[PDB]
Amino acid sequence: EDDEFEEFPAEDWAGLDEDEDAHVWEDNWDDDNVEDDFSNQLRAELEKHGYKMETS
Amino acid sequence: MITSAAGIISLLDEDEPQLKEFALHKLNAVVNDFWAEISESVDKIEVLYEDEGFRSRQFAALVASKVFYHLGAFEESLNYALGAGDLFNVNDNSEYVETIIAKCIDHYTKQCVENADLPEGEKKPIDQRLEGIVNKMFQRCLDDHKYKQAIGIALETRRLDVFEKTILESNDVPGMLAYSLKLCMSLMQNKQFRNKVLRVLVKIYMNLEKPDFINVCQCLIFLDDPQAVSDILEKLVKEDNLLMAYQICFDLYESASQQFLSSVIQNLRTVGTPTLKMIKILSGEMAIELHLQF
Amino acid sequence: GTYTLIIRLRHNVIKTGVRMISLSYSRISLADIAQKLQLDSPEDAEFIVAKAIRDGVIEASINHEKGYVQSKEMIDIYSTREPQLAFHQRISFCLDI
Amino acid sequence: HGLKGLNSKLLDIRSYLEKVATGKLPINHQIIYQLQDVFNLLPDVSLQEFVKAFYLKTNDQMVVV
Amino acid sequence: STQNRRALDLVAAKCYYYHARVYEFLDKLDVVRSFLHARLRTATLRHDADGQATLLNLLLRNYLHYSLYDQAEKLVSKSVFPEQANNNEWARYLYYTGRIKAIQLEYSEARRTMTNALRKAPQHTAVGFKQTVHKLLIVVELLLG
Amino acid sequence: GPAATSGAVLQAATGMYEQLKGEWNRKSPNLSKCGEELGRLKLVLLELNFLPTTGTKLTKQQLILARDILEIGAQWSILRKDIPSFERYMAQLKCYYFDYKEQLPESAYMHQLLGLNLLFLLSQNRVAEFHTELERLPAKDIQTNVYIKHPVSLEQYLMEGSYNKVFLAKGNIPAESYTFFIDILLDTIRDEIAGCIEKAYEKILFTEATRILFFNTPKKMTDYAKKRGWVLGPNNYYSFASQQQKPEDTTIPSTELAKQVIEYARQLEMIV
């Protein structure tokens, strides 16, 4: 008989870093791969490769 | 690894009989935390145990019995334990004989049952070294004076010589006679063996102290040899022990049945062929009268 | 003592990178396979893919005289037993409860 | 118990065919006739397609189980 | 606890547990490994399931705190973990046997034992134990593919 | 037998394991005879009672002096060859590499013999043990001892088929004893490579097959295009054995799946 644990260290915290909150979210591993990169990724790719001047 | 006999076991590539002996002592000492691994390399030990040229086969027999003692499997522990010869014994008082004598004694009584009861190749399968461990332990029961223990062991192995010497030891004769009547009536199942205990229970009511004729009577009832109770009753009547020839006939009437009471009066008539007071007690006439008056 | 397990994952990041390229494309050149996987050479790629194949983890083929790996994918999963094996798993678990 | 039927029915036909072939018993063309329709009707010739379908209908069966 | 009777074995479960814990600071004495061993085989013949399991756990923890994985593997195999055991004990054993299966290149069994482990640790709290079995489960799935 | 006659056997091993290091320079056939007598001075050491340590400091400093006698003897046990030969030594030593942490010092010759203990488990194709063993030496040591790093990454390439592993079997020269033994593995490598290529392609030219299996000549490649059974047209042509005949038969399932169905029924009918 036992009922305890005390053989492994733990971590307890009140400074908690943030992620996507989960309440019934689909929690897709796809949305952690981006950073709202999507406006940036357009602008920079329309100027760099000139597809806002050469190509409509 | 440390605490792994990998360093030990991997030895024996050169054939140096002093490399096998120094090995089966450094291993034999520590089979109490290495075993789990030994299990994998038992073959090096069995091959050594089978070859008789090596004198190191007594510890190979022990170390072998030490793999199946810590594995729990047992069974094989008996074949290697008895192959250790005198290194394994009852008196060195180890955890090995602690367990291995339970496993031995049950492995042995299992055998003497099926064997002594059925074939004519009875003991032939049975090893003699196992009987030696059984008798070495049993005599410990007669030396410790635990006749209260040996009285039952003597029905496991089902040898009545064990049982016949257990009763004689010390002045514990009239008590043992009290155990062996309770077990002959409740414990005993096999009618054959039960009868074989009752006969030896008859001989010790004659050759031990004053014979008690209230006991040999009951036992002759359960053995059903009428021609012998008729002559145990017809030698106290000739010696003017009628006071002890009544006690036999009232037992026979109450305890025994009518086809026994008709065999004994018939044996006294075949003997009487070239008075009759006991013929009036074995018939039950006088007892009928007494009960009526009652 | 986890660090011993971690270093092994280098096998799997490439296992997945490549089984991912197989399901993204139908045929591609080894020169590009090395560029998406951050691999070594176009020499290294052909051996890596090949290994995948022999371990039935990509089901494709290679034409080496032209330099491209080509997928053979065209199964509709249902001709497999796979779904029936998956269910045979589910309901044994479930029923045991 | 159904196979316990098919088994002995077929068994009886086998004893009959074996009965006319040898240990002669004059042939009755009619029996043998019908006995040919039997071996044409056995489910065989549409093997591959049938396989791919039967597997699918099973798949459904499990989904609902 | 060397004494007799079968009820003291149970409280000796807790005894052993703290015994090892304190023995483990200064330096996890491998000396105790033998005591444990000796008291373990004894328990297998007294058929004290409880003590047998608990004790077997602290033993496995001994082999694992050092690099004696082979020695725990051949053991885990050759031995029979009791049937009745407090769950805490069963979670320990299912975290260790899974650790072992993991190191010897067998992520298969592991991912299925690992998980059973996470789901036997007491629910409301168990902070550290759960916190570590995660750090391993997360990697056994990755490794598995 | 005092500890000074035991010592008098240790010096009798200094006269044979400095001749093993002087016949290593000259590379004589007397390099073989100073190791046939360190396999005899073994059988003289175990009688001076120097089996693995279980206490006693006097025997401890006598085991740093009997450990050597198995190092420099094991090294010749390799070049002497035979599987069980250099095998049954490695045991002893990995045992005396925890005794060496116990109460003894360490040497730079301890973690490089163990490395060979790894390579030996690669050419025996028992990668299950390689990893357990890899976990005996602390993790921070396989990044800094760049003698062990090559056995490790050799297993990385070995387990997940990546080639350029035949090229790195002559580039792991920082420890020469690696390049002596690893040659064994190179006959399994060719086998796995052709095992995949039997499925991965269908037409290549002959000289390319000579460049892939790491051969230099055309003759060798004829023999190995004969054992696998290929034809020798202008380009080396393959035979389809990847999925020669498909599993288009669920008649083979038939019986098995029916067993399963029956089983479900048993669980839905049993009395629980």
Q: What is the DSSP string of B11-36?
A: --SS--HHHHHTHHHHTTT-TTTSHH
Compute CA F126 distance to the chain's CA centroid, rounded to the nearest angstrom.
8
- Residue B76 contacts by C-beta under 8 Å, 6 or more apart in sequence? B64, B65, B67, B68
* Domain boundary assignment for chain A: 1-49
Q: Note the maximum CA span of chain D.
A: 56
The rounded distance, in Å, linking the Cα atoms of B8 and B27 is: 7
- E136 interface with C at CB cutoff 8 Å: yes
Phi, psi dihedral angles at B97 (to 5 degrees) = -65, -25
Please report the sign of the dihedral spanned by the C-alpha atoms of residue E52, residue E57, residue E60, residue E65.
negative
Taking contacts as CB-CB distances below 8 angstroms, the residues of chain E near B70 are: 41
E143 at the C interface (CB within 8 A)?
A: yes
**DSSP 3-state assignment of F250?**
coil
Q: Can you point out the beta strands (E) in B174-236?
A: none
Structure tokens at F134: 């890899």
- Give the Cβ contact number of residue F266 at 10 Å: 8
Taking the C-alpha atoms of residue F16 and residue F19, their distance in angstroms, rounded to an integer, is 5
Ramachandran region, residue E126 (left: φ > 0; alpha: ψ -120 to 50; beta: rest): left
List the one residue out of C53, B133, B37, B242 whose CA is nearest residue E68: B37
Chosen from D51, D52, D54 to mutate, greatest number of chain F CBs within 10 A:
D51
Residues of chain C contacting E145 with CB distance shorter than 8 Å: 12, 15-16
Give the strands of the sheet with C27-29, arranged side by side.
C27-29, C68-71, C60-63
Question: Which residues in chain B touch residue E34, judged by CB atoms under 8 angstroms apart?
Answer: 32-33
Q: How many residues does chain B have?
A: 294
Q: F36 — contact with chain B (CB < 8 Å)?
A: no
What does DSSP assign to residue C27? E
Strands C68-71 and C60-63, how do they pair?
antiparallel
Mutate to test the interface with E, among F97, F99, F132 (most CBs of E within 10 A): F132
Give CA–CA dist E134/C2, Å, rounded: 12
CB within 8 Å of F220: residues ≥ 6 apart: F210
Burial of F59 (0-12, 13-18, 19+ CB in 10 A): middle
Cβ pair B85, B131 in contact under 8 A: no
Distance between CA atoms of residues F29 and F227, nearest Å: 38
CA distance F4 to F62: 11
Dist CA E46 CA E3 (whole Å)? 13
Distance from CA of E10 to the nearest CA of C (A): 31
Q: Which residue has the tokens 């790894």?
A: F118
Q: Which residues of F touch D51 (CB under 8 A)?
A: 248-251
Task: Enumerate the residues of chain E whose CB falls inside 8 A of the CB of residue C6.
Answer: 139
User: Which H or E run contains F76?
Assistant: helix F64-80
Chains with ≥3 Cβ pairs under 8 A against C?
Answer: D, E, F
Structure letter (DSSP) for residue F155:
H
Closest partner CB to E10 (pick from A1, A3, A12) = A1
Q: Which two tokens stand for residue F165?
A: 């592993």
Q: How far is it, in rounded angstroms, from Cα D31 to Cα B34?
A: 78
Do E121 and A11 count as a contact with CB atoms less than 8 A apart? no
Local structure of C71: helix, strand or coil: strand
- CB contact under 8 Å between C10 and F160, yes or no, is yes
Distance, CA of B264 to CA of B284 (rounded, Å) = 14
Chain E and chain D touch, per 3+ beta carbon pairs within 8 A: no
DSSP state, residue C62 = E
Sign of the alpha-carbon dihedral angle for B14, B17, B18, B23: positive
Asked if F205 and C47 come within 8 Å (Cβ–Cβ), the reply is no
CA distance E66 to F22: 40
Resolution value (Å, 1 decimal): 3.9
Elucidation method: cryo-EM
Query: How crowded is the C-beta side of C9, counted as CA atoms within 13 Å?
Result: 15
CB-neighbour burial class of residue E28 (10 A; exposed 0-12, middle 13-18, buried 19+): middle
Concatenated DSSP letters of B233-293? HTTTTTTT-HHHHHHHHHHHHHHS-HHHHHHHHHHHHHHH----STTTTTTTHHHHHHHHH
Amino acid at the residue B135: N
Contacts of C84 in chain D (CB under 8 A): 55, 58-59, 62
